[PDB]
Amino acid sequence: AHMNDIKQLLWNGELNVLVSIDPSFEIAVLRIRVPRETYLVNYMPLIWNKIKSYFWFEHNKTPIPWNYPVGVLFDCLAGFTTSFENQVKDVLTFLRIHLVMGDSLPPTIIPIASSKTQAEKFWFHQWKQVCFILNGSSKAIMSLSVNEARKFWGSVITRNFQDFIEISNKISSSRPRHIPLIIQTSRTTFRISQPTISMTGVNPTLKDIEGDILDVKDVMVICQGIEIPWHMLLYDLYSKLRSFDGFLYITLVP
């Protein structure tokens, strides 16, 4: 009952996003709501529509990838203990990103293809890999019907929680062989790591993998925008706070 509640709360995740438009293109500064569990490019059509008056996104002059869940980007671009109740009055939590245009594409990020097919294909192939990690093969996801594969992604676009849960569970590993975990530092020196954590014969706690987390370089473990106790079980953590792309993301913050 609680895993469902937890997942619903994650699906409801939503952020105030300030989209600063590059003069080169209140139309200069868009204010939109974007869920944590989705990609920024899924909202490009909404951004273009508003400004009927290459390109990529940037945070504080640094190009940002689009292939990470918005919530994950937020965790590493916005640098918690403070409850809403004890929070100073009227603190505005938001993400400011810039839509810029240029002659040459920034070298470190996958370019935005603006084809409406790019995001879905990437995301689906990635779940195929997450399935490989969890089960040892992509059988479960490849066994989905064509209708189901399309509806799986459709749920991300329309926010259909029921469909996303039905399909993500179908393909989700009874007991993972390994945990699909990604550890990263703040993007404001950036380090990212995908450690190999086996579940065979063990039941690791966050503290148990302290070695891996620390290899990425006094630090607070943030997952889904919240602090996680070092004694929580990895599997539990993954099964509950993994993002809409199948990966569990941990962000290290001071």
């Binding site: 995740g13 204010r31 009227d90 939590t93």
Partner: peptide, 24 residues
């Protein structure tokens, strides 16, 4: 309960992130 802790923290997160959403 660990889940009660997560439920509580996620609700708070969503509340903080939703504050002043009328400006967006």
């Amino acid at each position: 309960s660990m889940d009660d802790l997560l439920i509580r923290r996620l609700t708070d997160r969503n509340d903080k992130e939703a504050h002043l959403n009328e400006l967006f």
